[PDB]
Design a protein around this ligand. Structure first.
Ligand code: HEM
Ligand SMILES: O=C(Nc1cc(-c2cnco2)cc(C(F)(F)F)c1)c1cccc(Cl)c1
Length: 433
């Protein structure tokens, strides 16, 4: 008998959907086959995520650390599982995500969002198909590169297609872990790290010549590595931020645009809100963001049904009773905001898209909703992400109407993160048509 055999479990669709079916059938503690245990009670979410006693399970993060023998995220901020090592770097990099730091990024967010809208407006003939997944990804990449690194990827101009291909193949590599695929994945990872080395060299050379370098994420990434023996830790975090800083944001934007294409009444309300708050202004100030209350709620509801980062793992070190189930020591505990978001025990009519769930008067979900995770290992980029997505969405809503091309699906794919299966192909018209 397996050490886990006694635990309840089985004897456009994703693995997370199978997990949801099993959680509904088998209850709050379910074995899935490494063997992990999916824990879906809010009591468990609170117990394990809100304590520094419980740390990430390194075995479950190996696929981010190294892919086919090529160091990827290595021991960067996401994939480092040793508390003390993580804590040291977290505290330093946190400085780049202060309120004042993020306020300064509004210029970048505005400029890239405006560039996107202008590109889209020229195609708004109600006929030309536009992949909103692609366009939102390019926007997210361009935002990240500029905001975090002071680098112009110019993906919105159709530049850096090799870099684009490298990201794609790398993401495929994470999932995979024959002949040509290994070659393409390995070279793509080395490419991304090389991008890092090139840019860090440029930064250091600029600093030496006494040129102006605005403090950014890269500043703190460098700071975290002060007096390191090599640059491998630095490049770990370069790649971590390069990828994490755009991928989930892009996914979230794509899901939101996809969902809203079948929510005309919600779209009408969103259009009205932007009209009242910002009017025809070309630029959103920081104070405008807080005023976009209904948009905030829509984006929260989007993350409930469509969290790009579906959850997290913690290592259970000692045998523990969890919701009446004996769980052996040395076991990965799997938490899923995707699963809990779709369980009727936690959310009434879970498949209904209802922004009012996040309304001012509504009881806030208690440990049943965590698209940015919870506790010490929550997303460092949460406020960064929320700001940039609000800027992008507000400008789209100001200027454009979108219709999803018939045949386009609302299904998901799972490729390290969750994202729309289809390209979110739309036709566009200017608002007032
Ligand atoms: C809507 C967009 C985003 C979502 C849904 C999201 C979600 C998450 C989640 C669920 C985690 C926990 C991951 C885990 O436990 O394995 C996480 C961690 C992280 N995210 Fe994000 N994220 C987003 C945007 C960003 C952005 C914009 C950045 C950087 C600019 C970023 C960088 C990170 C980093 C570095 C971590 C690791 C934090 C730590 O452990 O100290 N994310 N994010
Ligand atoms: O792949 C995992 N996490 C992941 C997170 C992010 C992220 C977080 N914040 C912003 O982007 C981005 C990525 C990607 F590289 F695909 F873009 C992957 C992973 C690996 C092992 C276990 C678990 Cl639970 C999750």
């Amino acid at each position: 008998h397996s050490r886990y055999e006694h635990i309840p479990g089985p004897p456009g669709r994703v693995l997370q959907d199978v997990f949801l079916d099993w959680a509904k059938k088998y209850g709050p503690v379910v074995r899935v086959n490494k063997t992990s245990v999916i824990v879906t009670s809010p009591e468990s979410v609170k117990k394990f995520l809100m304590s520094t006693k419980y740390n990430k399970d390194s075995k479950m993060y190996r696929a981010l650390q190294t892919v086919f023998g090529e160091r990827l995220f290595g021991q960067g901020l996401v994939s480092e599982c040793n508390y003390e090592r993580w804590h040291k770097q977290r505290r330093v990099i946190d400085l780049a995500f202060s309120r004042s730091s993020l306020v300064s990024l509004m210029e970048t967010f505005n400029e890239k969002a405006e560039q996107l809208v202008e590109i889209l407006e020229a195609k708004a003939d109600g006929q030309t198909p536009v992949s909103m997944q692609d366009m939102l990804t390019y926007t997210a990449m361009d935002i990240l590169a500029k905001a975090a690194f002071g680098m112009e990827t110019s993906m919105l101009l159709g530049a850096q297609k090799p870099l684009s291909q490298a990201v794609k193949l790398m993401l495929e590599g994470i999932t995979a872990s024959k002949r040509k695929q290994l070659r393409e994945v390995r070279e793509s990872i080395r490419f991304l790290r090389q991008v890092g080395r090139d840019w860090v060299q440029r930064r250091r050379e600029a600093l030496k010549r006494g040129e102006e370098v605005p403090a950014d994420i890269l500043t703190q990434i460098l700071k975290a590595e002060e007096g390191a023996q090599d640059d491998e830790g630095l490049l770990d975090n370069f790649v971590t931020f390069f990828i994490a800083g755009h991928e989930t944001s892009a996914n979230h934007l794509a899901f939101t645009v996809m969902e809203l294409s079948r929510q005309p009444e919600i779209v009408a309300r969103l259009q009205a809100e932007v009209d009242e708050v910002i009017g025809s202004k070309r630029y959103l100030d920081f104070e405008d963001l807080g005023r976009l209350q209904y948009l905030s709620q829509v984006l929260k509801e989007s993350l409930r049904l469509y969290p790009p980062a579906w959850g997290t793992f913690r290592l259970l070190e000692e045998e523990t009773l969890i919701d009446g189930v004996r769980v052996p020591g040395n076991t990965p505990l799997l938490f899923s905001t995707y699963v809990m978001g779709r369980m009727d025990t936690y959310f009434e009519d879970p498949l209904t898209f209802n922004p009012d769930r996040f309304g001012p008067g509504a009881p806030k979900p208690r440990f049943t909703y965590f698209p940015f995770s919870l506790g010490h290992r929550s997303c460092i980029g949460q406020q960064f992400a929320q700001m940039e997505v609000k800027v992008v969405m507000a400008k789209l809503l100001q200027r454009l109407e979108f219709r999803l091309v018939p045949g386009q699906r609302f299904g998901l794919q799972e490729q390290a993160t969750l994202k729309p299966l289809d390209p979110v192909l739309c036709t566009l018209r200017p608002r007032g048509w």
